[PDB]
């Protein structure tokens, strides 16, 4: 299938406490493999998966040396931006950059991004040609003129499609085992009634890798026709996902009822039933 | 790996 | 239009005296700034590498040490220098973040320590 | 230097002949490529630098970088008596420039 890399970055302005906390964090696909925490005693860039340990002591000093770049950058980006918006500096404010790209099945470039936010709001985004940026309000259209005039877009275009790239293919071939893998999710279906008439028929899909999955509800076929409660695709801890979908069908005909579980890991779509 | 190019502050 | 300007350019020294050399920057803001040593026949090697916030590495120079005691004020210093610490001395800068602006040097300070 | 190797010289090229500078590096993550002259006594200066595959020419001065053989080159064309000095060849491998240890040519008049 496709395959990604993304680094995701969040500093956050502490008034009266010095410096910022900045948080970034690194993953392939749906598996984090980097951190670096501004408050941790080791000051480093660290791993979070097997594959990438194996990496030298230069990697790991040069990561480690630009992540505190990239932290530092946004700490004086804090204060250019309670400049632009007329802010105080008794208030607490958020700094967010992501940026990475995506890999098709043949392991080829198929697209970039790198977006910043401030206060939970979008801010500046390059645009999917690489080189057009798209700006919030009046402030981010001077960092706009900013980054034209040093092509910046030029700069991120080289990284997203080029080293991005060579890199996420390198990590999923060191960390195959990993992140190769395709863990089918465990499924289950559960009964809860409601003493009279219609009762309610939960879907289960665990211990499932990546995290992309469909669990959709059919009555007699074809057309997928029932109202389902169905939770957010989440995490258990484990390194695989969990989630559910639920019906509420009327007592009896209950067999009319087939859940569709649709997964990478399944050869074939699967189909559950209520058996007692 | 982290871009090294194309990150100036606003 | 940036500047980037070094003092003293060349200082001839006996062992076991104190080292301060001063680097300065004008026309950029939060920049950069840079410790580098060069050997006679090699090229720069870099002592401390420090953002507009403080350092961000170093190759902690075994008798060295660097401040910067303003936005555009870089100091390298030495309590009791050693005859290995004879060389070329360079700071240099480049702009905020991880770009293509700057990367400049400035004159050099030319350090001989003599026994 | 291990990291960056560069041929020392001294290498002369005739008035006017081309001269080509070598230089490879062995940090893979390195997005950014530097060249810069050093005169006898002088600190060094930036010639230029290149972010992407290919040749960027400025002037007489072309630079080439081919990042799967990591390799990075630098051409000067009509090359004259005041070309004569040490080229420094240099990558960005995170936050900071790393050096080889140059390559030191002399132009005949």
């Known amino acids: 299938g496709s395959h990604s890399m993304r680094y995701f970055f969040t500093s956050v302005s502490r008034p009266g406490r010095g410096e910022p906390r900045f948080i970034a964090v690194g993953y392939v696909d749906d598996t984090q493999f980097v951190r670096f925490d501004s408050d941790a005693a080791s000051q480093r860039m660290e791993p979070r998966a097997p594959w990438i340990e194996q990496e030298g002591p230069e990697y790991w000093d040069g990561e480690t040396r630009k992540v505190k770049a990239h932290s530092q950058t946004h700490r004086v980006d804090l204060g250019t931006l309670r400049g632009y918006y007329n802010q105080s500096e008794a208030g607490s404010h958020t700094v967010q950059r992501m940026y990475g790209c995506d890999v098709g099945s043949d392991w080829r470039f198929l697209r970039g991004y790198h977006q910043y936010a401030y206060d939970g709001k979008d801010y500046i985004a390059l645009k999917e040609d690489l080189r057009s940026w798209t700006a919030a309000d009046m402030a981010a259209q001077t960092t706009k003129h900013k980054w034209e005039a040093a092509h910046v877009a030029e700069q991120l275009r080289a990284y997203l499609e080029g080293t991005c790239v060579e890199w996420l293919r390198r990590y999923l071939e060191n960390g195959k085992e990993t992140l190769q893998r395709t863990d089918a999710p465990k499924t289950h279906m559960t009964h809860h009634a409601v003493s009279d008439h219609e009762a309610t028929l939960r879907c289960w899909a665990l211990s499932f890798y990546p995290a992309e999955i469909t669990l959709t509800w059919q009555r007699d076929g074809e057309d997928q026709t029932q109202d389902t409660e169905l939770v957010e695709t989440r995490p258990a801890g484990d390194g695989t996902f969990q989630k559910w979908a639920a019906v509420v069908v009327p007592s009896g005909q209950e067999q009319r009822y087939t859940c569709h579980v649709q997964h990478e890991g399944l050869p074939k779509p699967l189909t559950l039933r209520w058996e007692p | 790996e982290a871009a090294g190019i194309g990150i100036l502050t606003v | 239009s940036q500047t980037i300007h070094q003092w003293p350019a060349t200082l001839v020294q006996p062992v076991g005296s104190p080292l301060s050399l001063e680097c300065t920057v004008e026309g950029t803001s939060n920049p950069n700034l840079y410790w580098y040593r060069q050997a006679a026949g090699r090229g720069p090697q870099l002592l401390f590498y420090w953002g507009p916030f403080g350092q961000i590495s170093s190759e902690v120079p075994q008798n060295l040490s660097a401040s910067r005691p303003q936005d555009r004020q870089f100091i390298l210093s030495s309590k009791k220098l050693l005859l290995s610490d004879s060389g070329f001395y360079l700071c240099?800068?480049?702009?905020?973040?991880?770009?293509?602006?700057?990367?400049?040097f400035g004159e050099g300070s030319r350090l001989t320590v003599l026994e | 230097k291990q990291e960056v190797e560069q041929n020392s010289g001294p290498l002369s090229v005739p008035e006017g002949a081309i001269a080509s500078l070598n230089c490879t590096y062995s940090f893979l993550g390195s997005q950014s490529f530097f060249w810069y002259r050093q005169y006898s006594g002088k600190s060094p200066e930036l010639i230029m630098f290149?972010?992407?595959?290919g040749d960027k020419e400025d002037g007489r001065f072309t630079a080439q970088l081919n990042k799967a053989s990591q390799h990075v080159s630098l051409l000067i064309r009509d090359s004259q008596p005041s070309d004569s000095a040490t080229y420094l060849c240099?990558?960005?491998?995170?936050?900071?420039?790393?050096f080889g240890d140059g390559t030191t040519l002399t132009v005949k008049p």
């Open positions: 290149t972010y992407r595959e």
């Open positions: 240099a990558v960005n491998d995170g936050g900071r420039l790393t």
């Open positions: 240099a800068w480049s702009e905020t973040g991880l770009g293509m602006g700057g990367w400049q």
